């Protein structure tokens, strides 16, 4: 069959919004506190994550229907899904080739180890790399990747949300476009949609596992002091 | 005449404590977010100031009598006198030669202008340079400089302090050693003591003028978000 204009105008919006919030050359990474290989990578990664939270917010604002939600629900979705969106968008810098996010020379190349000198057991980093590898293998078109992020950011099932029915609607519409698109434009994608949805579940686990780790980190002032105001807020529970 | 052992043991302590908290080569300044010439210098200077607050705390802990105060009064003195101590210790990097703090090549050389791209009018930076120049000209022995910082940090007249009588005592003792020292060891210092005390007053003005500027900066989240957790705390009024 074939897509309608409305859906297509959504694709344009997300693909463009993402382009506007993701630099494939990672040139701003030098404005961060330099990396260092008790949690020497923390200052750097705190800046990396904070930088990205700002970017995720830019992408969310341009997600159709999202800005017409109440500050509370927007904030609700942002707070709860942030870390997830960070994990998805990160995929574009990931590399099965060397199992790591490559955003520069030796400096901005993040190995599994680096995230350890940032306050995270190795046993938890494991499921991350598995996710990155799995996600990367789906070889998503940029239209599918940008959709998947919108869908995730619009999960009605987030602690803090109110109008869970309106969010439910927006996400359902985004889910249609993704299915409709994979059909009309993605060959051999008969079982991709299912796979993409599955990815969201994993994000949930990773999300929760991070919560627990970040919770400990934060309760320790000599470490939470390394974080940035924005991160402390988005991941804090002052809600 | 000549100093007693007690006083002298105080000098040893302050001079050593300062040596332990002040790197004349400014090698850690590269762990800060790089400088950038709307307030592009803010991220850097926020890190510089935060770095220093940590150092001032290390110096304070080793100030005799100080750690035997209640957390509250220590914190009280730290919060209120912090910016002042930062201005004094900064003198060692200042340079009448080129009217600026030189802590490295072009990067870590702070001109009056740089503090402007950090959220501060030029009209307020003026009294700072005047202070730095005046202070620098007193050509203080390291023993006098380290004393002056202890005296300042122990000013009983600080909003928030409780046992203002015990702080009054400690500061009085430190004031003696300074006078006694300038007498026995500093030639032509017949009127230096008076000059050093005068410096404290100026610090008060500078202190207040900063409060007002930092207050505005902080109330704006797009700017306060640039600051560090420690700075937000020491200069915040959650007290």
């Amino acid at each position: 069959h074939m897509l309608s204009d409305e859906q297509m105008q959504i694709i344009n919006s997300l693909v463009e919004a993402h382009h506007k919030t993701y630099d494939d050359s990672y040139s701003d990474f030098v404005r961060f506190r330099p990396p260092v290989r008790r949690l020497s990578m923390l200052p750097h990664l705190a800046d990396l994550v904070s930088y990205s939270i700002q970017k995720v917010i830019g992408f969310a604002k341009m997600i159709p229907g999202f800005r017409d939600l109440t500050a509370e629900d927007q904030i609700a979705l942002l707070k709860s899904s942030a870390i997830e969106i960070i994990m998805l968008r990160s995929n574009q810098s990931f590399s099965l080739e060397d199992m790591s996010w490559s955003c520069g020379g030796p400096d901005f190349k993040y190995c599994i180890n680096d995230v350890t000198k940032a306050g995270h057991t190795l046993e938890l980093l494991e499921p991350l790399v598995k996710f990155q590898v799995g996600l990367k293998k789906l070889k998503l078109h940029e239209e599918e990747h940008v959709l998947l992020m919108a869908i995730c950011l619009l999960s009605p099932d987030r602690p803090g949300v109110q109008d869970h029915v309106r969010i439910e609607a927006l996400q359902d519409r985004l889910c249609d476009v993704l299915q409709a698109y994979i059909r009309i434009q993605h060959p051999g994608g008969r079982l991709l949609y299912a796979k993409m949805i599955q990815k969201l579940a994993d994000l949930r686990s990773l999300n929760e596992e991070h919560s627990k780790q970040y919770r400990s980190l934060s309760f320790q002032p000599e470490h939470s002091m390394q974080l940035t105001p924005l991160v402390l807020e988005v991941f804090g529970s002052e809600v | 005449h000549m100093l007693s052992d007690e006083q002298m043991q105080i000098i040893n302590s302050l001079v050593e404590a300062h040596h332990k908290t002040y790197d004349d080569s400014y090698s850690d300044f590269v762990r800060f977010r790089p400088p950038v010439r709307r307030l592009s210098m803010l991220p850097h200077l926020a890190d510089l100031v935060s770095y220093s607050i940590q150092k001032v705390i290390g110096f304070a802990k080793m100030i005799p009598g100080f750690r035997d105060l209640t957390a509250e009064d220590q914190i009280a003195l730290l919060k209120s006198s912090a910016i002042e101590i930062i201005m004094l210790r900064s003198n060692q990097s200042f340079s009448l030669e080129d009217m600026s703090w030189s802590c490295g090549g072009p990067d870590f050389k702070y001109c009056i202008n740089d503090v402007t791209k950090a959220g501060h009018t030029l009209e307020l930076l003026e009294p700072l340079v005047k202070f730095q120049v005046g202070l620098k000209k007193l050509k203080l022995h390291e023993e006098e400089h380290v004393l002056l910082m202890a005296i300042c940090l122990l000013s009983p007249d600080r909003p928030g302090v409780q046992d203002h009588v015990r702080i009054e005592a400690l500061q009085d003792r430190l004031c003696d050693v300074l006078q006694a020292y300038i007498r026995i060891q500093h030639p032509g210092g017949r009127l230096l003591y008076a000059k050093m005390i005068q410096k404290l007053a100026d610090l008060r003005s500078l202190n207040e003028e900063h409060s007002k500027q930092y207050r505005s900066l902080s109330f704006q989240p797009e700017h306060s978000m640039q600051l560090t957790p420690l700075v937000l705390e020491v200069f915040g009024s959650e007290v």
Binding site: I75, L230, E233 | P221, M225
Partner: peptide, 10 residues
């Protein structure tokens, strides 16, 4: 409060 997030969402 979420002062930062509010400002960022315009």
């Amino acid at each position: 409060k979420h002062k930062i997030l509010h400002r960022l969402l315009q």
